[PDB]
Protein backbone atom coordinates (compact mmCIF):
# COMPACT_ATOMS: atom_id res chain seq x y z
CA UNK A 1 0.00 0.00 0.00
CA UNK A 2 2.30 2.85 1.50
CA UNK A 3 4.62 0.90 -1.05
CA UNK A 4 3.28 0.92 -4.25
CA UNK A 5 1.77 4.13 -3.96
CA UNK A 6 5.04 5.82 -2.92
CA UNK A 7 7.23 4.31 -5.70
CA UNK A 8 4.72 5.41 -8.12
CA UNK A 9 4.10 8.63 -6.57
CA UNK A 10 7.79 9.04 -7.64
CA UNK A 11 7.80 7.62 -10.95
CA UNK A 12 4.98 10.06 -11.91
CA UNK A 13 6.48 13.46 -10.66
CA UNK A 14 10.00 12.49 -9.33
CA UNK A 15 10.62 10.30 -12.98
CA UNK A 16 10.59 11.23 -16.62
CA UNK A 17 10.56 9.75 -20.41
CA UNK A 18 7.22 9.04 -20.35
CA UNK A 19 5.98 5.90 -22.96
CA UNK A 20 4.02 3.25 -23.33
CA UNK A 21 2.31 1.53 -20.36
CA UNK A 22 5.27 -1.12 -21.02
CA UNK A 23 8.45 0.51 -20.33
CA UNK A 24 8.60 4.16 -18.37
CA UNK A 25 12.32 3.82 -17.95
CA UNK A 26 13.12 4.46 -14.42
CA UNK A 27 15.89 7.31 -12.46
Same mark, same amino acid.
Given at each position: ?????????? @???? @???F??????? @??
Open positions: IAILNKLCEY @NVFH @NKTELPRARV @NT
